Amino acid sequence: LGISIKVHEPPRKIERFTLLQSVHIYKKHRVQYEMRTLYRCLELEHLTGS
Amino acid sequence: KNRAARVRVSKGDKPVTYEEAHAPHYIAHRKGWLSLHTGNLDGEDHAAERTVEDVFLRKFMWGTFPGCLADQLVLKRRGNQLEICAVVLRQLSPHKYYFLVGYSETLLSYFYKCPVRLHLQTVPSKVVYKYL
Amino acid sequence: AFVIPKKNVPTSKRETYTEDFIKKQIEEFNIGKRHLANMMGEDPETFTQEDIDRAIAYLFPSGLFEKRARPVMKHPEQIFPRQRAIQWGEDGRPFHYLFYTGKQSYYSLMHDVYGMLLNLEKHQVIGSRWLIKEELEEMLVEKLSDLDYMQFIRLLEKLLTSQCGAAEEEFVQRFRRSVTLESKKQLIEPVQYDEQGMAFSKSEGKRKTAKAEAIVYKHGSGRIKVNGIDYQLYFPITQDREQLMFPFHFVDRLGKHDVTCTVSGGGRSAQAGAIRLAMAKALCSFVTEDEVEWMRQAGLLTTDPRVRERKKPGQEGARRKFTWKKR
Amino acid sequence: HYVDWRMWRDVKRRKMAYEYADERLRINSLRKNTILPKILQDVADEEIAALPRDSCPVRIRNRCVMTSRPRGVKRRWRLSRIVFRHLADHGQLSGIQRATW
Amino acid sequence: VNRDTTAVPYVFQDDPYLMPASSLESRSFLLAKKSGENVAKFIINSYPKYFQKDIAEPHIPCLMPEYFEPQIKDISEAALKERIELRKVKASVDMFDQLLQAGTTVSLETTNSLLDLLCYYGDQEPSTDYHQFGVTWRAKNNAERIFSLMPEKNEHSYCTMIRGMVKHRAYEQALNLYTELLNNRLHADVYTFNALIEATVCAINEKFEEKWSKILELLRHMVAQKVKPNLQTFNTILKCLRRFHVFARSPALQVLREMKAIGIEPSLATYHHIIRLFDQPGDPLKRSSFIIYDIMNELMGKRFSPKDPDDDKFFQSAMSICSSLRDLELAYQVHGLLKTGDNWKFIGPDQHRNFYYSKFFDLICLMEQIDVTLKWYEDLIPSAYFPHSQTMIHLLQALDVANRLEVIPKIWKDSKEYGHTFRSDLREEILMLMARDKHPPELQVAFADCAADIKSAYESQPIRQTAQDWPATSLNCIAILFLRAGRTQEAWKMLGLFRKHNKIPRSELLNELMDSAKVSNSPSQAIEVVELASAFSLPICEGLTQRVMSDFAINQEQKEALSNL
Amino acid sequence: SFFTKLTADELWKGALAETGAGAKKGRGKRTKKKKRKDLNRGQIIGEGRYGFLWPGLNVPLMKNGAVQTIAQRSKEEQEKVEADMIQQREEWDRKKKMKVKRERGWSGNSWGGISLGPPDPGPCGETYEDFDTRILEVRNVFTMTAKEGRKKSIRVLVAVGNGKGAAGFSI
Amino acid sequence: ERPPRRKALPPRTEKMAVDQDWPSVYPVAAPFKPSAVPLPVRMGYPVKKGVPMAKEGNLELLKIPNFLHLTPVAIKKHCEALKDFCTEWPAALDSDEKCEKHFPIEIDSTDYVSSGPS
Amino acid sequence: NHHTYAELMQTLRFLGLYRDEHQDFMDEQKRLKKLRGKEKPKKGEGKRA
RNA sequence: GACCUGGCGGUGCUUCAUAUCCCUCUAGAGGAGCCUGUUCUGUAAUCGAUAAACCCCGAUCAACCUCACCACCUCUUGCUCAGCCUAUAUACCGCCAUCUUCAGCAAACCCUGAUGAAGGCUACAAAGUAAGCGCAAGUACCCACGUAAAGACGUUAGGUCAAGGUGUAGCCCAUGAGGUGGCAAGAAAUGGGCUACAUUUUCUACCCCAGAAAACUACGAUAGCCCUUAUGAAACUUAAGGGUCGAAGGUGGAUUUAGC
RNA sequence: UUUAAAUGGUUGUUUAUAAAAAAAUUUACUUAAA
Numbered sequence A: 001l002g003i004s005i006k007v008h009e010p011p012r013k014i015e016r017f018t019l020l021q022s023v024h025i026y027k028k029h030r031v032q033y034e035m036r037t038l039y040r041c042l043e044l045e046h047l048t049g050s
Numbered sequence B: 001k002n003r004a005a006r007v008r009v010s011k012g013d014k015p016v017t018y019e020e021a022h023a024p025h026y027i028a029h030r031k032g033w034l035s036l037h038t039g040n041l042d043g044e045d046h047a048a049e050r051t052v053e054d055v056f057l058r059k060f061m062w063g064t065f066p067g068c069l070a071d072q073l074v075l076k077r078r079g080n081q082l083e084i085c086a087v088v089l090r091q092l093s094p095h096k097y098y099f100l101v102g103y104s105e106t107l108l109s110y111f112y113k114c115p116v117r118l119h120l121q122t123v124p125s126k127v128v129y130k131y132l
Numbered sequence C: 001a002f003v004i005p006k007k008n009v010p011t012s013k014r015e016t017y018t019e020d021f022i023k024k025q026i027e028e029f030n031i032g033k034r035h036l037a038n039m040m041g042e043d044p045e046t047f048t049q050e051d052i053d054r055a056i057a058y059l060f061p062s063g064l065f066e067k068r069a070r071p072v073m074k075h076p077e078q079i080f081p082r083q084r085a086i087q088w089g090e091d092g093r094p095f096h097y098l099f100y101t102g103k104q105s106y107y108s109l110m111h112d113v114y115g116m117l118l119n120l121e122k123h124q125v126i127g128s129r130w131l132i133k134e135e136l137e138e139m140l141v142e143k144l145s146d147l148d149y150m151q152f153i154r155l156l157e158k159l160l161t162s163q164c165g166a167a168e169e170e171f172v173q174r175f176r177r178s179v180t181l182e183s184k185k186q187l188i189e190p191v192q193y194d195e196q197g198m199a200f201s202k203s204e205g206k207r208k209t210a211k212a213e214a215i216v217y218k219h220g221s222g223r224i225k226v227n228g229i230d231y232q233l234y235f236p237i238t239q240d241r242e243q244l245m246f247p248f249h250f251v252d253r254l255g256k257h258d259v260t261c262t263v264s265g266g267g268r269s270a271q272a273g274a275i276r277l278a279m280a281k282a283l284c285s286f287v288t289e290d291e292v293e294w295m296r297q298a299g300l301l302t303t304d305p306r307v308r309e310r311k312k313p314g315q316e317g318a319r320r321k322f323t324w325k326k327r
Numbered sequence D: 001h002y003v004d005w006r007m008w009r010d011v012k013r014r015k016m017a018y019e020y021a022d023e024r025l026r027i028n029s030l031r032k033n034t035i036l037p038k039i040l041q042d043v044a045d046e047e048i049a050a051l052p053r054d055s056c057p058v059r060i061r062n063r064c065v066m067t068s069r070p071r072g073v074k075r076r077w078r079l080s081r082i083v084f085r086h087l088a089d090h091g092q093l094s095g096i097q098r099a100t101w
Numbered sequence E: 001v002n003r004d005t006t007a008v009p010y011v012f013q014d015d016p017y018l019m020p021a022s023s024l025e026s027r028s029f030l031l032a033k034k035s036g037e038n039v040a041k042f043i044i045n046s047y048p049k050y051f052q053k054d055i056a057e058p059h060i061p062c063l064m065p066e067y068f069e070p071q072i073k074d075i076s077e078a079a080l081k082e083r084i085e086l087r088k089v090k091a092s093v094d095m096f097d098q099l100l101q102a103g104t105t106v107s108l109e110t111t112n113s114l115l116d117l118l119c120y121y122g123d124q125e126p127s128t129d130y131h132q133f134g135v136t137w138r139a140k141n142n143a144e145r146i147f148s149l150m151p152e153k154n155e156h157s158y159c160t161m162i163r164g165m166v167k168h169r170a171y172e173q174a175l176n177l178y179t180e181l182l183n184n185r186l187h188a189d190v191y192t193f194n195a196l197i198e199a200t201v202c203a204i205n206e207k208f209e210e211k212w213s214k215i216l217e218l219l220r221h222m223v224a225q226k227v228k229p230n231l232q233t234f235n236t237i238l239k240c241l242r243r244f245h246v247f248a249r250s251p252a253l254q255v256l257r258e259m260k261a262i263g264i265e266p267s268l269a270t271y272h273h274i275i276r277l278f279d280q281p282g283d284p285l286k287r288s289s290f291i292i293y294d295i296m297n298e299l300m301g302k303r304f305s306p307k308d309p310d311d312d313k314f315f316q317s318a319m320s321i322c323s324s325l326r327d328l329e330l331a332y333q334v335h336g337l338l339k340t341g342d343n344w345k346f347i348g349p350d351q352h353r354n355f356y357y358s359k360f361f362d363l364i365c366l367m368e369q370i371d372v373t374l375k376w377y378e379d380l381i382p383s384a385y386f387p388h389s390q391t392m393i394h395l396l397q398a399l400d401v402a403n404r405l406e407v408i409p410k411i412w413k414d415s416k417e418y419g420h421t422f423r424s425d426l427r428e429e430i431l432m433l434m435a436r437d438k439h440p441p442e443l444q445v446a447f448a449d450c451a452a453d454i455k456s457a458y459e460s461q462p463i464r465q466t467a468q469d470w471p472a473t474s475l476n477c478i479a480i481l482f483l484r485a486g487r488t489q490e491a492w493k494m495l496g497l498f499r500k501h502n503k504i505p506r507s508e509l510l511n512e513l514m515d516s517a518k519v520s521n522s523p524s525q526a527i528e529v530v531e532l533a534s535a536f537s538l539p540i541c542e543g544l545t546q547r548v549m550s551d552f553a554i555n556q557e558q559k560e561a562l563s564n565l
Numbered sequence F: 001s002f003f004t005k006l007t008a009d010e011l012w013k014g015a016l017a018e019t020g021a022g023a024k025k026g027r028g029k030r031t032k033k034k035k036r037k038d039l040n041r042g043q044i045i046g047e048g049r050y051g052f053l054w055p056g057l058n059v060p061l062m063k064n065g066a067v068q069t070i071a072q073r074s075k076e077e078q079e080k081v082e083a084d085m086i087q088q089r090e091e092w093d094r095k096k097k098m099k100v101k102r103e104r105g106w107s108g109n110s111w112g113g114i115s116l117g118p119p120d121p122g123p124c125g126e127t128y129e130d131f132d133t134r135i136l137e138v139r140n141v142f143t144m145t146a147k148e149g150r151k152k153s154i155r156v157l158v159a160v161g162n163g164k165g166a167a168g169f170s171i
Numbered sequence G: 001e002r003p004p005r006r007k008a009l010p011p012r013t014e015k016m017a018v019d020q021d022w023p024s025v026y027p028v029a030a031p032f033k034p035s036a037v038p039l040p041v042r043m044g045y046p047v048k049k050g051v052p053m054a055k056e057g058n059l060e061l062l063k064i065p066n067f068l069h070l071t072p073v074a075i076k077k078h079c080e081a082l083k084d085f086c087t088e089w090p091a092a093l094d095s096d097e098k099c100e101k102h103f104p105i106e107i108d109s110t111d112y113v114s115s116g117p118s
Numbered sequence H: 001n002h003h004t005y006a007e008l009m010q011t012l013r014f015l016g017l018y019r020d021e022h023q024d025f026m027d028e029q030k031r032l033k034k035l036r037g038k039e040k041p042k043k044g045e046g047k048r049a
Numbered sequence I: 001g002a003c004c005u006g007g008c009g010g011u012g013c014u015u016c017a018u019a020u021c022c023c024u025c026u027a028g029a030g031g032a033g034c035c036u037g038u039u040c041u042g043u044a045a046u047c048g049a050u051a052a053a054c055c056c057c058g059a060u061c062a063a064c065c066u067c068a069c070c071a072c073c074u075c076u077u078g079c080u081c082a083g084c085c086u087a088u089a090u091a092c093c094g095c096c097a098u099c100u101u102c103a104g105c106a107a108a109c110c111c112u113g114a115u116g117a118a119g120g121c122u123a124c125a126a127a128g129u130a131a132g133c134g135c136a137a138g139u140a141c142c143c144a145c146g147u148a149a150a151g152a153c154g155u156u157a158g159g160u161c162a163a164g165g166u167g168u169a170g171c172c173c174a175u176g177a178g179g180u181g182g183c184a185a186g187a188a189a190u191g192g193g194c195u196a197c198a199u200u201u202u203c204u205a206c207c208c209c210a211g212a213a214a215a216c217u218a219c220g221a222u223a224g225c226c227c228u229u230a231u232g233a234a235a236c237u238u239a240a241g242g243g244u245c246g247a248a249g250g251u252g253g254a255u256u257u258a259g260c
Numbered sequence J: 001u002u003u004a005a006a007u008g009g010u011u012g013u014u015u016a017u018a019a020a021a022a023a024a025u026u027u028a029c030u031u032a033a034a
Ligand SMILES: [K+]
Pocket: none
């Protein structure tokens, strides 16, 4: 389409949190989950509204 | 010993699918996610409402197609659309499948106020990954 | 008669791939290969396996960490396990005189090497590694024991020790693989020239969370600027200034270079370590090859991998446990 | 059809608190300043205290929407740790995996 | 993007088990899906409470429950208007009566709206989700009773009453009401005049000349009252003029010529009525030939929009005439018009679409080169329609004429995929064509494989539940195809079937069985050939036996052969 | 709550208690050992308590060449369907209650002298249909393991013969 | 039963030519259908002495958001049809400095595309 | 809205369009308890008085 | 009587343990104050965990609510085609502890012991072949290191009917539901943690070249008391800040924890 | 060859067969007449 485009990768964000292993007691034992958010940034330039 | 979502060894006669054979520590290593939406991305909203909807849909489809589902659902959300991908068996007559697809797509579209499509893929029998 | 509940079709049902099945899979790959080239708008006749992999990656993007679980479109010969052919004909007579051993390929090879040694007796390195066990089994398409592997290598070694002809040496080289030895020789950075024509080298250094960039000038008075500040003002602690002296003192070049370095992250000691590494690497451009090796053997060119270990759940620290109570 | 009577009591509290939120905000504003006369602020103190007890927002409890567990709930999903783990360990929560590092 | 020829229509599930495999499954699979949607809608409107939580932004009105019951319970004119808007014929009429008994005033407009509702539906409730021949108009109907009750009757009240009567086949009563309309010196609208034209033609069984005079008289009344004719005025004339098959042709053309002069542009429905009038069962089709050629020249490259309810019936009628004239170039022009712009949407319902494509593909196979016929075969089937068993026979005949019989095995495979595995006519045609003449070894082998597959279909017939029939020609052909390919073992088994089913083998099958035995040089087999033909008393057997006796026959067998006769 | 309902497989696994401490080391012996019943066996898709007839699911889609519309079985008609369903269940249940007459061996509860049928056919299309098998002894032998303690094994003596001189026995 | 159980037709990839117009098969985003994609693609961690699972009934391939509707051929055809909607950037505004001189003010706004009913 | 989910799926079960495996399980158990005599008593007219 | 298998032996020999058994290395706990559990006692006034494998444990959390407790009052087809945190974790699913800081479990066969319970290795080889599971390999994090994760079969009828579900038994004008108010203390003992006893210290500036302090006005409370503020409808109580106050404590008995 | 080192309530820790079945829809317009 004739658009000037440049791509870079912003740094990823990893959010982690901890939960108990057992339903009852056994506090020392945990399960750790995470959600990874990866990024890509498309930078377009000099466009018209249409 | 850990228990979560682990099909335990039998006598080598229990057929398991590929999803049921992989424990939770493989969910981003060997198997993927059964639902893909944006709720759980950083800075995104409405993770809670998406979760309740997914739980309901998996229950709805299990009871609406009793004995037909050959594996777990794959729920896809793109913008306003919801797409349910189900691997079913080839036992129920095609007429009954078409009726249930027209019924479930309409009923679910009115319940969650969005266009819903159901994409069925039929298999002769349950795909066995291994015998545990 | 009490009927013992009979067994169903064997559940294990180990999958065997007959030769006709493989042939049908090859035909499918060739047709699919032409479809994939048609999808991607490329020439069917020059579509390679590296183009197939690139197309499959784009069309079926999978982020699964393990690459063996990702979608694959390879030649059936590379996918399906190599399977031994039928070892007997319709009459039932096996095709090999050593069939009844169960290791006809292994023992046939063992027989061959022994025969060669007999004839040789009657007639009379660093790069190459002896073929490992798992890879020898592949050649023979038979399962071997560790002690079986040892015995084979002992004969092969015995064959090399004795004088050998052209034929015998070629036979051994079938079972020798190539080892590419990594060179532990430091890479020298290019000598650049600034606007004024002064020769300088630039390198990077990392220590814990500190990252340094050092510009070492070929000629100077011994002036080190850290983030635009004189080094003694930037590093008031003596130990930190001793770390900056070590690279230049070790090569007897104190007072002969100017340094402009930028450091960020980490604490006072990590930053001095990161600068020490960046300066040593850049200084390698202005010393002799032998001196670069001495610097490497003094620990001046290695990135220190020691980084803070994470704290585990259910413990006090990375290693520190909670107080244990027997009762 | 709520999980238990406890969840049902929280449902009613969230409903009553919603209905009275504007009135409570208006009366509370009269009390949370030093500008208005203390005589007026004392009458506002009585008026907000006379509102139904279940309109008080502090009485609302974030219970698990699936099991009604009053503790161990993750606010983003509104699920108890047990229910969350059950859905996460089966690969049914988009983008949530076991963390190793 | 373009249509994918390998796929069935997008409405169906794209799965080999769920894809429709026949023309009937095509219809039934969609009807089943529509039934599911109706059941869901029935539940949604039965229990609105469950579907009242709106989580959509922006709001979607179409995805909300529908409420069909009147929510105004007061007895008043304003509350009555609701029941008319809801189309509650019985509730509205009952409430209007109660309103009249109470003595409150009902506006003329509200009364006219009630008459519109009552006249259109014939005082019968419109069909709901859940709770042809003859005149539907009834003398004791609510419309008539209310019409008399009206204190003031304007032009619209009479109009809607006339239109209602004609819609319900009360032609004579509608004409009488128009006479009353004229006695009151009230002008009729265009739509009333269009209904009145139909009334005069259907009412009486007079000859064309009298009916034509009546129609022309209404047109003169229309002009006298300053009423401008619309497109429907002329389309009803042409539709009415179809009963008088050969008398209305020239008059019908005059009506068309009048349209163009006035400025009313003929739609697709207009030309549909004309070609149907001109295309009656006559061998010459000389007039029909001229009309269709001229109509197509006018319509070339014209994008159409829906103007008349009969616009969807043109293409099927145009293609039917092209098949009768057997003009392929004209058919390509008709199809060309269908494909321009958005004209493809006028093909019509499913049964219209199937008829159009059946007539079109049958004409291609007959009148075009085989190489182009096969391209049309691939593009149209199954993506456009599912073929009838008779169209496969036409394609087989086209392949025969072109001497391209290597495709016959493929046609059989496709036929089985399109629901013609157990069609007797198709199975007999394929076998006969394959066995009609001798072919090279490779083609003979392929025909044997197809014959073996056709044989399995005969063996696995679902008609077996009723009765299993093996036609004589089919059996003979299968056996000959096995013998020519060299599967003598399989052919020898067929010899038992002939006597089992009491099917007489042809002489060509027996004469060719000689070589099979001679090459083997097994006199025992040679006698078996003689034994069977002797059972049927075929004259060739006796003369044949003597030749076999000369070539290869055991002495003991020779004596027995003669006595068996 | 609809969200607290589990599937049949989970409900039966809990109720049956086939895997538990009670079964590890002959701990709990219960004559009233619960048996699994598949409750989807006789159920037809589209059949409910209200008795609606859904065209294309519960009933045929087309009748008399015309698409059927939504209908509901009358009260008395639904009663018959419900009564028949109860009768079908009772009949199916009756079949399971029936005890097949087992030919007893030397004693009522003894394994000695009970026929095991013909030996199974060999892999190479080999058959022993002439031979008859009869149990001679069934013993519960035990060994002791470090992990589990008493490990129960079954020792069985069987004889085989064709009745024409060829006979053998094995453990 | 009057017939036997309904048999599934053969997959329609067997009718596809190797020079077809693929964008017509996958015009829009759709789930992976093994019977419509003429590729012997396999996926799944293989068992010992095993191969990745075939595509039929493969739920891992169904979980992927595939790009079969966005092949390079389709994207180029799509963009040729979308050129009519575009307007030309003013040639005068070559550089950012030129943009600032003629248009001193800059307004930043953000639009967020998420998946869901709202 | 647990009322909507529970009531919708109960209506769909009575209509024949949803199979509730759980509810089927507790209907069989409740049926076997009547044959065993463990039936819920009449309210008010209970064992106690 | 004689054996088989296992366990155990203050049982032999040999080789070893790498934060590990001893010797050794560093900082701690047991002494003081305070915080927070538990046990006892107390209260009209929850429950569960409670050698290793309980004791800042279910709780990433109790002023009302939460709540399941107590007192009083009220309701009876009841938010639910009811309900019950009523009994049974010795009926169970689910999720786990533990050996495991393990490497074994094992179908299907074959052979040995005269065809007994059972047993099955020697490589210059003598009866074992072994699918599958675990280990391993791979993968995550910064490497191929390390750390995570993983860790089968079984052991302790180990933990959890109080996450939720559920078998059996029990309650149904009450063992169900709702409202108001209220209890959650310390004679005593004890686990874990926090802050200290100071000069390698205390205060200020600074963030490492300083000035002062340094024993009855020193070091030392996050305690007590008073006041203010924050949140809340509600604070003697929860938190924060200020003022006042300046106590025990002077390096800790037997014993004991962690770290390569 | 080589210090001393006692105790642990009662009863409970092992055998008879396995599994349902179903049913179809039933190939190609428009129109009209009396
Ligand atoms: K022993």
